């Protein structure tokens, strides 16, 4: 459960939030595959409740209604489509898993669903699963509303409605199979692995009884006894009853102090400062390495929807955003999974954005497709935060130190430090409000390397930035205060 099951030299995942099946077939041999990627999470591909109020929320999709593979993202076609082309080219799949819940008990009954199954949340009924009444645990929770009001309290963690989201009893057998049953479609599809949603709202023991009834992955392109990779969203902060390393035994966890600490330390407030980052990881209170999966945002706190809140970076603060991905990709702390979003019309009203709920981009609720502009960037309002040459380029950097220890650590007690990898690769890192100009040992075989972060390398070519590295393994950097992007990295690979 606890590897990623990616191609060897592969060491990171994307999030193509809310992307249509076929442009992630297409941007996986066409980006995904050539620049090294390891693998790409995607959506929800199950059928969800269409909310017309809002419209069509971004939200919607963690609200089941079936496990048909139908929704905005394409069909069981489509999907069994892009599994098979991204597998092919080496790029693995997985699969967002919203196993906990249905969708919200206060919606109307009907067919306003992706693929038009009829639901009646008021009477429990979801007859494309087929679920009941008797699959819920209306009668388990013990709080007056019926919904999760206290989090001091485990047991209704678990048991009760997550703000009014039916939830399922993934005690009886009967649900443990069912979803053990659309897991193992998957699976036999070609995933290589899930990410359990709301994973702090089920028993560790819940959890494990539905992994225990899962496929190994399909031998086409897996070695035979191989398990699919599980990572569970656990949102622990530090002072709650329940701990991320309940839930060691299923798989890996999510780290979500490690964006949050990260956030505040390269923004440089309560008094943190990247010289602090010398003994990154669990030193700093994080779960172990090899049970970490990191990332700088995700879908849910870029908006503000989740656990960091205000010291989240994210693509809307750039600069410091690619520096923070920068330090995570090059770190050996954790398994690294990179954001790719897209744009939506931001409206604070003191301090919250009323558009935050704002889906993907659409014509009038169809999923505007994926248009990849002349430099490479991507149009139709589409961020491709992966795209991005500074992103990009680091995703290959932990590639290529993948295995290297972490050495020749600097910095000024300030904003300015820089460490290598082994003899792989080294990066230096300007956050202070003066320029940088120092000589440095970096622990890197003598030549002239490309900076990876202003440029690239090209046939023995760089565009950007070089580096001389002399027989010492010293060599010199110089970064302004005022650089566009204050950090530079060079690598084995990068090498002219
Ligand atoms: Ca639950």
Not at 43 to 72: H, M
Not at 281 to 309: C, K, M, Y
Not at 381 to 400: A, G, P, T
Request: one cysteine or more; hydrophobic letters at 35%.
């Amino acid at each position: 459960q606890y590897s990623p099951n990616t191609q060897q030299g592969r060491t990171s995942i994307v999030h193509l939030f809310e992307w249509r099946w076929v442009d992630i077939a297409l941007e996986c041999e066409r980006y995904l595959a050539p620049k090294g990627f390891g693998g790409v999470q995607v959506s929800p591909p199950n059928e969800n409740v269409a909310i017309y109020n809002p419209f069509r929320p971004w939200w919607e999709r963690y609200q089941p209604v079936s496990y048909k593979l139908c929704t905005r993202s394409g069909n069981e076609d489509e999907f069994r489509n892009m599994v098979t082309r991204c597998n092919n080219v080496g790029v693995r799949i997985y699969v967002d898993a919203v196993i906990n819940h249905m969708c919200g008990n206060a919606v109307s009954a009907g067919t306003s669903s992706t693929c038009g199954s009829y639901f009646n949340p008021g009477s429990r009924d979801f007859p494309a699963v087929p679920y009941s009444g008797w699959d819920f645990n209306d009668g388990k929770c013990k709080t007056g509303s019926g919904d999760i009001e206290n989090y001091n309290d485990a047991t209704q963690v678990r048991d009760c409605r997550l703000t009014g989201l039916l939830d399922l009893a993934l005690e009886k057998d009967y649900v443990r199979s069912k979803i053990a049953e659309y897991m193992n479609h998957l699976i036999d599809i070609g995933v290589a692995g899930f990410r359990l949603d709301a994973s702090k709202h089920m028993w560790p023991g819940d959890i494990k009884a539905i992994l225990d009834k899962l496929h190994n992955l399909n031998s086409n392109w897996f070695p035979a006894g191989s398990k699919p990779f599980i990572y569970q969203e656990v949102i622990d902060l530090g002072g709650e009853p329940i701990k991320s390393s309940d839930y060691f035994g299923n798989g890996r966890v999510t780290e979500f102090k490690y964006g949050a600490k990260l956030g505040t330390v390269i923004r440089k407030w309560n008094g943190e400062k990247m010289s602090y980052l010398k003994n990154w990881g669990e030193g700093w209170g994080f779960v172990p390495s090899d049970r970490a999966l990191v990332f700088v945002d995700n879908h849910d706190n870029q908006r503000g929807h989740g656990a960091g809140g205000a010291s989240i970076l994210t693509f809307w603060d750039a600069r410091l955003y690619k520096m923070a991905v920068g330090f995570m990709l090059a770190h050996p702390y954790g398994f690294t999974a990179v954001m790719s979003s897209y744009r939506w019309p931001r409206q604070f009203q003191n301090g919250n954005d009323v558009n935050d709920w704002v889906g993907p981009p659409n014509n009038n609720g169809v999923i505007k497709e994926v248009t990849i502009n002349p430099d490479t960037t991507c149009g139709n309002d589409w961020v491709c935060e992966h795209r991005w040459r500074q992103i990009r380029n680091m995703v290959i950097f932990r590639n290529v130190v993948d295995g290297q220890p972490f050495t020749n650590w600097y910095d000024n007690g300030s904003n300015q430090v820089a460490f290598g990898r082994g003899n792989r690769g080294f990066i230096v890192f300007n956050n202070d409000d003066w320029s940088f100009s120092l000589t440095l040992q970096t622990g890197l075989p003598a030549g002239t390397y490309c900076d990876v972060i202003s440029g690239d390398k090209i046939n023995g070519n760089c565009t950007g930035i070089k580096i001389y590295v002399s027989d010492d393994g010293k060599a010199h950097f110089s970064i302004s205060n005022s650089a566009e992007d204050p950090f530079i990295a060079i690598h084995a690979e990068s090498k002219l």
